[PDB]
Amino acid sequence: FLGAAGSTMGAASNTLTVQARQLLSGIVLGVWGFKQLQARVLAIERYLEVQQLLGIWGCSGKLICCTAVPWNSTWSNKTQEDIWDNMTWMQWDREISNYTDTIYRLLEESQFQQEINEKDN
Amino acid sequence: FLGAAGSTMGAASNTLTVQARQLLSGIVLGVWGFKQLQARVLAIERYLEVQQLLGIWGCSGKLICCTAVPWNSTWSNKTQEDIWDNMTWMQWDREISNYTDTIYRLLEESQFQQEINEKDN
Amino acid sequence: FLGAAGSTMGAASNTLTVQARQLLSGIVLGVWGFKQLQARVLAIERYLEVQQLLGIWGCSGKLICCTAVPWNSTWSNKTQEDIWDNMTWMQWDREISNYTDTIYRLLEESQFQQEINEKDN
Amino acid sequence: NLWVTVYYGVPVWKEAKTTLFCASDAHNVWATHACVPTDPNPQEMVLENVTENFNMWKNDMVDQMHEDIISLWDQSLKPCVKLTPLCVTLNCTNVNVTNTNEEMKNCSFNTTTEIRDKKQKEYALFYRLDIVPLNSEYRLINCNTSTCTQICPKVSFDPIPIHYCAPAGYAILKCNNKTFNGTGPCNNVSTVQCTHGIKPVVSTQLLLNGSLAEEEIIIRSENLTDNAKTIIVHLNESVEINCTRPNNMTRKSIRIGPGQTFYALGDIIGDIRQPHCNISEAKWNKTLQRVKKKLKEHFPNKTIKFAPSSGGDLEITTHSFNCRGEFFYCNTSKLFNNSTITLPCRIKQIINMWQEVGRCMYAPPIAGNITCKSNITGLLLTRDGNNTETFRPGGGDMRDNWRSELYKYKVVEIKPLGIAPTKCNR
Amino acid sequence: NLWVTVYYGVPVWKEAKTTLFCASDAHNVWATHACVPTDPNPQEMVLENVTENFNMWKNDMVDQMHEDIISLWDQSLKPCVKLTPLCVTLNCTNVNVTNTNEEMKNCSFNTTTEIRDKKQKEYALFYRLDIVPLNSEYRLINCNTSTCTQICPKVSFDPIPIHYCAPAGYAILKCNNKTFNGTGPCNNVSTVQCTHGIKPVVSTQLLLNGSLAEEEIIIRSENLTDNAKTIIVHLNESVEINCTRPNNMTRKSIRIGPGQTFYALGDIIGDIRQPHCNISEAKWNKTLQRVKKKLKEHFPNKTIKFAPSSGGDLEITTHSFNCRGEFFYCNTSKLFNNSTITLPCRIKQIINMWQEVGRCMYAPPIAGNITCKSNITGLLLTRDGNNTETFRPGGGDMRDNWRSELYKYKVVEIKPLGIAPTKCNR
Amino acid sequence: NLWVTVYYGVPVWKEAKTTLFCASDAHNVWATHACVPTDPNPQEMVLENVTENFNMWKNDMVDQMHEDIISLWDQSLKPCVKLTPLCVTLNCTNVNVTNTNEEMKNCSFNTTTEIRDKKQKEYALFYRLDIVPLNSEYRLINCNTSTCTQICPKVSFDPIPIHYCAPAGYAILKCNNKTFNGTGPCNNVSTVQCTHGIKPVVSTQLLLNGSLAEEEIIIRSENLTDNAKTIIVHLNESVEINCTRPNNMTRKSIRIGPGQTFYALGDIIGDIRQPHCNISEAKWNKTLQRVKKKLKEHFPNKTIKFAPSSGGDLEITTHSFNCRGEFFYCNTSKLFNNSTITLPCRIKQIINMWQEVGRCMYAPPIAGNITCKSNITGLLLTRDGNNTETFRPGGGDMRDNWRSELYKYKVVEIKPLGIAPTKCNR
Ligand SMILES: *[C@@H]1O[C@H](CO[C@@H]2O[C@H](CO)[C@@H](O)[C@H](O)[C@H]2NC(C)=O)[C@@H](O)[C@H](O)[C@H]1NC(C)=O
Ligand SMILES: *[C@@H]1O[C@H](CO[C@@H]2O[C@H](CO)[C@@H](O)[C@H](O)[C@H]2NC(C)=O)[C@@H](O)[C@H](O)[C@H]1NC(C)=O
Ligand SMILES: *[C@@H]1O[C@H](CO[C@@H]2O[C@H](CO)[C@@H](O)[C@H](O)[C@H]2NC(C)=O)[C@@H](O)[C@H](O)[C@H]1NC(C)=O
Ligand SMILES: *[C@@H]1O[C@H](CO)[C@@H](O)[C@H](O)[C@H]1NC(C)=O
Ligand SMILES: *[C@@H]1O[C@H](CO)[C@@H](O)[C@H](O)[C@H]1NC(C)=O
Ligand SMILES: *[C@@H]1O[C@H](CO)[C@@H](O)[C@H](O)[C@H]1NC(C)=O
Ligand SMILES: *[C@@H]1O[C@H](CO)[C@@H](O)[C@H](O)[C@H]1NC(C)=O
Ligand SMILES: *[C@@H]1O[C@H](CO)[C@@H](O)[C@H](O)[C@H]1NC(C)=O
Ligand SMILES: *[C@@H]1O[C@H](CO)[C@@H](O)[C@H](O)[C@H]1NC(C)=O
Ligand SMILES: *[C@@H]1O[C@H](CO)[C@@H](O)[C@H](O)[C@H]1NC(C)=O
Ligand SMILES: *[C@@H]1O[C@H](CO)[C@@H](O)[C@H](O)[C@H]1NC(C)=O
Ligand SMILES: *[C@@H]1O[C@H](CO)[C@@H](O)[C@H](O)[C@H]1NC(C)=O
Ligand SMILES: *[C@@H]1O[C@H](CO)[C@@H](O)[C@H](O)[C@H]1NC(C)=O
Ligand SMILES: *[C@@H]1O[C@H](CO)[C@@H](O)[C@H](O)[C@H]1NC(C)=O
Ligand SMILES: *[C@@H]1O[C@H](CO)[C@@H](O)[C@H](O)[C@H]1NC(C)=O
């Protein structure tokens, strides 16, 4: 994990497998037992929270995903080629960090609209 | 969660997203630490049991599901419109409560038959 | 679980549902509470490790799976009909056990190639 | 034809008996610094067109909270200074008096402090409720069955409210019907994650700082025909109570064990008065008239009389409560037979509270001039046994004190997997 | 061409050393109220056409169960009354006698009970196996290395069976071959979730209330050539043993430590007899003949002799066992050299059982007239060193007692992910 | 048009404050047998073209490690022999002397060992730093505020390195810039799972067996303008230090409590010398010149002087450190004003280390002839208050000792869910 973090957005988009893989393990009695027990409960809770966030969107079980919602320009007006070949994921998040919550709400309600459209059967 | 529970079966069939959503969170050192640790282990065990039950049928990862098995009349002979437009979920379960286990066994074996039919490849 | 273990590979290939089913339950305060708590944490960690291994391959949520990679002869040159009708799964593993790690690496990298081939969109 | 179909998350809730976790708002005994902060965000969800059965005085939450507050008190009390060395014979005598108040004694003993060395005389005062004579000669009352540890002054046991939440998959349904009498069905039920208010106030015969009822006065009791089962009564309006200990007392920090400091009464500076509670007699008379009217509503026009306790212990026959550091016991025989009513209250130090075999506690004195202003909001009544019904204040079981607040809460687990028919094939 | 394929749940089981959790059927020391209830539902699954290697006396489950029963005993024994004040000099003398039985002494001491006050004389009886003389003058035997806490009478340490289960992903394979001698391969193996029977009965040289063997008699031993490794022998048929302590003794509830109560022998009402075990001499002779025949089957027609223990401690040289509250030690030299055979048995009180440095226990007396009827089902034999083999009862390591029941259980983890070739493309 | 898209596992790392778990390489106080084995496999991952802000002396890991080593020491020290009986008056006198060395006393007391029986005289030696006179007559220094338990000799408190790892979803970023001064941005940052080296060595004013710096010497300090904040200085090259206690002392195993053994100095066989440290004066002079040059680099050509401690306690004014079983305190006034430099060092026994209220420890003596060879690699400097700056060794806060090793580690949680636009429809 934390591999091409220094590379561009597009370059990072190709090497995301390692972060997905190394999430349930490492890089491969109150003395210490409770410490590792709490650690390994926290690990699975983090993994399951990621799974839940992927599930309530239309990406349950997919490394790559696409949605139906196109975002408004106010969040960012940067050009695509500049976006995917000049900066990294962190500064992109920092630019968006003020808007992450809004998109997740937009994501989840978009799924509800999509499922109900597909629920007509 | 527990939304249209007062509304009809059909009305409840449209507002089932909130119960599915709020299942890994709330409505948004033996002092208390062990208490919340045991609570949050119970939470994930409940969530994983639901996931297992959904997986061993043909509904792994779907809020809406359909099966191939049509149930016998003996469990209920009520008309569809009366079921879905006059009645809630609870005492409907109470009516089926005596037969809940049988359908689960019927569900899982019907699932196995569908795989082995699709496993011919 | 551990059912047709004595039967042939082909016979065992038909009765694998019970092992998949009975993995989150049984066959159906330091006195003992910590003992069962540690046991039921180990159970879910084992189940989640199996889920992760299935997910990072092209078999997320499938009891039966096929892959694109054909293996080399060096691991085994036994005939198919002999393989699937004469021995059991354990001696097969013991024959392959020296190669299990290599195939998993081959499995995961083959999976990545298939995604990037399907990621061209 | 129709086919069965599986829906994930239909609204069905099963029964109770799971585990709840604490939550405290923005030190003390029930560790506030050990619960997750409450996101206050008061949020509920009214369930229109529902009905369900509550069975208040059998609830799980009451038992969990009581068994848990015991595990908090008896775990914060674990590391404090014990008392076994302080049980020698006590050579005491009377204190100086000026007006008719016996009650306090100027005891003296020999304390082991540096081991196999000179032992101080170290006089100290003690109430004549913490002393038994082994016939001049006296001893601590609780040095015959159990040795107990003084509650360290650095921590304070005044109550601040606790919020009992539920983990995922568990919701606490709350009945908002005004006229609800604890058991039976009720409409207009909401769902909650974290309970409201509920301050762990320990009292007897007078619920203090409790949650008011609404509209009218309600009566709660297992079986009105049965006699041994307790009776709880809420109050339409709180009755103000103002209870004072008007003395200025000195705190002798004395040694006993290396790193074992024991705090005893030093001296009383000023006049020797009596501790005494105050109640508005007109307000109490109006409240008593209203409550007896409500109870006669529950009986066939039967005359009802009130009488004090019969023969219990000092923890039962008196309005035992916890003020700012001290433990008061008030003989409430005056209430139950512009002008205030005064209750004479005796203060105790080594108490056996919750009535455990193996537990007591030494309450270090507060430095004088303590007052407690609170609201009487509950009455704990029982009747015993012609054509008349007699009601007496009665405690014993502490659980009822928690039952008066959690009367509108039940815990239910969610059953998200539902099955139903429709026209769907695969 | 063929392609590899992944199957979820093929029957492959890996090795051992995981954690097991208790399960008790419908108080005592090994807390029954602390294990999950067993769904009895006897369910197994025979695995036809399999074979695997068992290595009994290296198993994990034996070590886990022993290390766990230690953590149960030494955790239930945590809150009981200690014994440090009761170690003063004891001025004792002999008890009244009528017939030839020394063995019991009428000791007297000075007990600290109210601290810095008058101390009672408080006579009490003590066996001349709990006493060492520091040369008239005596002391408790275990007040030189370790202080121990009397096992509180409210709890009872009689054994009821425990069921050791396995968590998910772990199955305990059980070998059902009748003639299985602990180690090696065996056919007709079933799989289980929760183990059968296994009562934690602590004994020595005579397994009591144990599981019978089947068909013939089996011999289990690490290496028959080695001498230091123990030997276990099951029994074709149980040999009934009936052991009685025929006295009526009084229990003096005495104080010592405020809130602490110590229970000592008060007096013996009636005749002074000896505690003695009973065995059917004809049945034992037949059993001994059969077992020595079985062992001569294992040796080249070698004459075999039995001899008692050589020089061990009273916990080893004698059939040490636990009756209904008391601890018996029987000199079994009679068995090993219509008519019954009698064993003289001495009863001990402060015992160092499991042979720990830092542990003993005081067993409060039972109120007289105690009997224990049980079945001898196991023999713990060892040999030492011409053309003869001599076998002696021998204990020391307590683990062997658990090994006699769990000889047919191993724990295995499941490997559900299997890989195999077939004609399947994507 | 473009559409938002969700990628699982983009490289974004959030902030800190999670929990870390131990890992030990191939007994002692910080239980090595209680951490998971480290798969050594030195593996990192350099992050090219990145930059981030480190804020060393506010880090989480330092606080977690210190609060955890306290919970290890004060939990391994839980079951050891206490000391309350050994606090009687001590009738002492001087020891025999031959050369000018007071310092050790031949104390004598009365120890309770068999309770209400004869008490031995049981002479024992004690340093005149473990003794306070209650004016011939003396007592243990720490029998006025806290009673402490001797660290049992079977365990050894010499440091072996610990490896602090991170659980899943958490990575410790490590800055590999050579000239890094603790705070600010730095390039060439790698990611790690388990930290390197870091031996928990407790010291003062002289970091011992610590990690060397690289290239030049670095200065770390909260605010160079502030005076109360500590100052840490790494060393370009280690300065060898060789400290010896040249006596042969006897260990009296004495009884105190049934199963309570206390170990006191028995006698000194041979000559009575002084404990002392040795440093290469030429090497130290060169090191001091280089470090003061580095600090004058940080100031506008200001003359800098060194002075010893002002008025602190013996734990602060002296190079307090832990040798092979003993606790040394060295007056380092010589260093700071082919020929070696000698430091006179006094050895203490009952120490209050980490400066807790309620904690001390008795260090049982080692059987003579102890030496410690180590490397000075750090200087803990502070300045107080004309046109001159004066630096003094200064400790007090123990956390700084851990801060000198973990200066290049931060913990970050991974945010695998990323969102970004592309031409993708559904
Ligand atoms: C007891 O009752 C008060 C009543 O509430 C107060 O009412 C007065 C006027 O009736 C109003 O001026 C105050 O703002 C109200 N709130 C107060 C005083 O906090 C309750 O609020 C409390 O439960 C009790 N008052 C106490 C303990 O002082
Ligand atoms: C010791 O052996 C008995 C044998 O089982 C009993 O056998 C008799 C006849 O042989 C039969 O009548 C009883 O019902 C059987 N069961 C009993 C007595 O429980 C075992 O059952 C026990 O392990 C032992 N008997 C004891 C301890 O009384
Ligand atoms: C203090 O410094 C040594 C330096 O490393 C040693 O260097 C010498 C030559 O300079 C070389 O011969 C040794 O192999 C090196 N390693 C040793 C001695 O272990 C550090 O290694 C240690 O931190 C210190 N040496 C001690 C404590 O003996
Ligand atoms: C107790 O106090 C009385 C007061 O008269 C005094 O005479 C006596 O000596 C004191 N001590 C004892 C042991 O009585
Ligand atoms: C306590 O110590 C005093 C010392 O004067 C002694 O006289 C007294 O008897 C001791 N105990 C009593 C009786 O209080
Ligand atoms: C409750 O108080 C209100 C306040 O005015 C009063 O009108 C009503 O009668 C009271 N009811 C009872 C039952 O006390
Ligand atoms: C209680 O009431 C009495 C009335 O006589 C008054 O004198 C006293 O001060 C009151 N106590 C208080 C207000 O604490
Ligand atoms: C012990 O018992 C004997 C019995 O003769 C008695 O004489 C003696 O006084 C008792 N106490 C002592 C200290 O010996
Ligand atoms: C125990 O107390 C008695 C009191 O009569 C005393 O005579 C005896 O010496 C004390 N200790 C002994 C020796 O038993
Ligand atoms: C076991 O007991 C049966 C019962 O009759 C007997 O036939 C058989 O010979 C015995 N075998 C051994 C080895 O004791
Ligand atoms: C043991 O056997 C003997 C035989 O003489 C008998 O007298 C005695 O009562 C027996 N004990 C019992 C049955 O407890
Ligand atoms: C202490 O040691 C001195 C040494 O002269 C001796 O005289 C004295 O008796 C001892 N004990 C006391 C109580 O002083
Ligand atoms: C300790 O015991 C001795 C016994 O000789 C006694 O003389 C002494 O006074 C006691 N305490 C002192 C003063 O050391
Ligand atoms: C560090 O040591 C090297 C070794 O030769 C030396 O060249 C350099 O000047 C030193 N720098 C400092 C700042 O001590
Ligand atoms: C310390 O240095 C002095 C120099 O005079 C030397 O005599 C002594 O032996 C040294 N101590 C050691 C090497 O432990």
CA E274 to chain centre: 24
Backbone phi and psi for residue D196, each to the nearest 5 degrees, phi listed first: -95, 145
3-state secondary structure of D404: coil
Beta bridge partners of D75: none
> F239 and F375 in contact (C-beta within 8 Å)?
yes
Exposure string of D231-265, with b = 16+ CB inside 10 Å and e = fewer, is bbbbbbebbebebbbebebebeebbbbbbbebbbb
Q: In this complex, do F171 and A1 lie within 8 Å of one another by their Cβ atoms?
A: yes
How far apart, in whole angstroms, are the C-alpha atoms of residue D175 and residue F68?
46
- Structural domains counted in chain E: 1
- Closest partner CB to B56 (pick from C21, C37, C47): C21
Nearest CA to ligand 14 atom 12: F216
Between the alpha carbon of residue E258 and those of residues D87, D141, E282, the distances in Å are: 10, 12, 55
DSSP annotation of B5 reads G
CA F236 to ligand 14 center in whole angstroms: 6
What is d(CA D141, CA D144) in angstroms, rounded to the nearest whole number? 7
CATH of the domain at D23: 2.170.40.20
**Ligand 1 atom with the shortest distance to the CA of D209:** 23
Cβ distance E178 to E215 under 8 Å? yes
Q: How far is the CA of D221 from the centre of ligand 6 (A)?
A: 22
Domain limits, chain A: 4-118
Tell whether the torsion through CA atoms of A33, A38, A39 and A40 is positive or negative: positive
The finding on whether E373 has its CB within 6 A of some atom of ligand 2 is yes
Residue D143 belongs to a domain: no
How many CB atoms within 10 Å of residue B76?
Answer: 14
CB < 8 Å to E143, chain F = 114, 258
Q: At what angle do helices C89-96 and C100-118 cross, to 10 degrees?
A: 90
In this structure, which residue's CA is closest to atom 1 in ligand 8? E91
Under a CB-based contact definition with an 8 Å cutoff, are residues C81 and C9 in contact?
A: no
Cα C80 from chain centre? 20
Q: F89, F90, F91: which to mutate for ligand 12, most atoms within 8 A of CB?
A: F91
Nearest-ligand number for the alpha carbon of F209: 3
Other Cβ atoms within 10 Å of F289 Cβ, number:
10
Q: How many whole angstroms from its chain centre is CA D142?
A: 22
Q: Which long-range contacts (CB under 8 A, 24 or more apart) does F181-184 make?
A: F181/F218, F181/F219, F181/F220, F182/F54, F182/F56, F182/F57, F182/F218, F182/F220, F182/F407, F183/F53, F183/F54, F183/F55, F183/F56, F183/F57, F183/F220, F184/F53, F184/F54
- What single-letter amino acid sits at D179? T
Q: Determine which residue's CA is closest to atom 4 belonging to ligand 7.
A: D340
Dihedral of CA atoms B47, B52, B53, B55 in degrees, nearest 10, equals: 120
User: Shortest CB distance from E358 goes to which of F114, F257, F259?
Assistant: F259
Q: Which residues have C-beta within 8 Å of that of residue B54, sequence separation ≥ 6? A: B60, B61, B62, D6, D8, D417
The answer to whether F416 touches F10, Cβ cutoff 8 Å, is: yes
Question: For this experimental structure, what is the resolution in angstroms?
Answer: 4.1
Q: Which pair of structure tokens corresponds to residue F413?
A: 């949680």
Q: Which residue in chain F has the smallest CA separation from E137?
A: F117
Candidates D116, D117, D258; nearest CB to F147: D258
Q: Give every CB contact of residue A85 below 8 A, 6+ residues apart in sequence.
A: A8, A9, A10
Q: Count CB pairs under 8 A between chains D and E.
A: 24
Helices (runs of H) and strands (runs of E) counted in chain D: 3, 28
Is E238's C-beta closer than 6 angstroms to any atom of ligand 2?
yes
C82: number of CA atoms within 13 Å, CB side?
5
F-chain residues within 8 Å CB-CB of A66? 3, 5, 422, 424-426
Given a contact cutoff of 8 angstroms between Cβ atoms, the answer to whether F181 and F220 are in contact is yes
Looking at chain F, which residue has its C-alpha nearest residue A66? F5
Render the burial of E217-246: b for 16+ CB within 10 Å, e for the rest: bbbbbeeeeeeeebbbbbbbebbebebbbe
CB D275 within 8 A of CB D346: yes
Q: Report the SS3 class of residue D412.
A: strand
- Evaluate whether chains E and F are touching (3 or more beta carbon pairs less than 8 Å apart): yes
Residue D171 near residue D191 (C-beta atoms within 8 A): yes
Domain that holds residue E190: 1-80+164-199+408-426
Structure tokens at E391: 């076998």
A and E touch per CB criterion (3+ pairs under 8 A): no
8 A C-beta contact, residue F272 and residue F101: yes
Q: Do D146 and E116 touch (CB under 8 A)?
A: no
CB contact under 8 A, D168 and B2: no
- Structure token pair of residue C78: 């036994």
The verdict on residue D299 lying in a domain is no
Q: Which amino acid is at F136?
A: S
Q: What are phi and psi of D7, to 5 degrees?
A: -110, 135
E3, part of any domain:
yes
Q: How far is E33 from chain F (nearest CA, A)?
A: 29
Contact between chain B and chain F (3 or more Cβ pairs less than 8 Å apart): no
Number of H helices, E strands in chain F: 3, 28
Give, in order, the Cα–Cα distances in Å from C12 to each of C8, C77, D308.
6, 21, 79
Q: Which ligand is nearest to the CA of D137?
A: 4
User: How long, in residues, is chain F?
Assistant: 426
Q: Is D91 in the pocket of ligand 5 (CB under 6 A)?
A: yes
Residues 6+ apart with CB under 8 A from B15: B3, B4, B7
Q: How far is B8 from chain C (nearest CA, A)?
A: 34
Question: Is residue E24 a part of any domain in this protein?
Answer: yes
Is A18 in CB contact (< 8 Å) with chain C? no
DSSP annotation of C120 reads T
CA distance F399 to F403: 6
- Residue minimizing CA distance to atom 8 of ligand 9: E110
Ligand 13 centroid from CA F110, angstroms: 7
Pairing outcome for strands E276-280 and E340-348? antiparallel
Among candidates A23, A63, A89 on the partner chain, residue whose Cβ is nearest the Cβ of F169: A23
CA-wise closest residue to D355 among D160, D140, D66:
D66
Order of all β-strands in the sheet with F104-107? F104-107, F124-127, F261-268, F249-255
Ligand 8 within 6 A of CB of E32: no
